[PDB]
């Protein structure tokens, strides 16, 4: 439905819990997280890896 | 006795060799996998030779 992909899923019991998603309004497209503060993705490959 | 059927139909990447071996889920006496009879061989009337 957001037409990326970046959330997992598989064989057995994979996707087991979303995502908390703030989808702010601004100019430069990131991602940013509440355990990784200082630190910024762009890519949300890197957000569902980490 | 638990049974896992129409194993014909799974997930493509996927396998129920853990499941049907007493692996992914342990029991006393195991799986037993059989493959029955979908609704085309239900329309086709699947003797038991075949």
């Given amino acids: 439905?957001?037409?990326?992909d970046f959330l997992p899923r598989?064989?057995?019991?994979?996707?087991?819990?979303?995502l908390v998603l703030?989808?702010?309004?601004?100019?430069?497209?990131?991602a940013e997280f509440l355990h990784c503060?200082?630190?910024k993705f762009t890519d949300f490959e890197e957000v569902r890896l980490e | 006795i638990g049974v896992i059927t129409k194993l014909d139909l799974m997930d493509e990447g996927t396998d129920a060799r853990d499941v049907l071996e007493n692996?992914?889920?342990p029991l006393r006496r195991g799986?037993?996998?059989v493959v029955n009879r979908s609704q085309k061989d239900?329309?086709?009337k699947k003797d038991i030779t075949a």
């Fill in chain 1, 37 to 39: 503060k200082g630190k």
């Fill in chain 2, 23 to 25: 692996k992914l889920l």
């Fill in chain 1, 10 to 18: 598989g064989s057995g019991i994979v996707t087991r819990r979303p």
């Fill in chain 1, 22 to 30: 703030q989808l702010v309004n601004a100019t430069t497209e990131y």
């Fill in chain 2, 31 to 33: 799986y037993i996998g």
């Fill in chain 2, 42 to 44: 239900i329309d086709g």
């Fill in chain 1, 1 to 4: 439905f957001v037409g990326r």
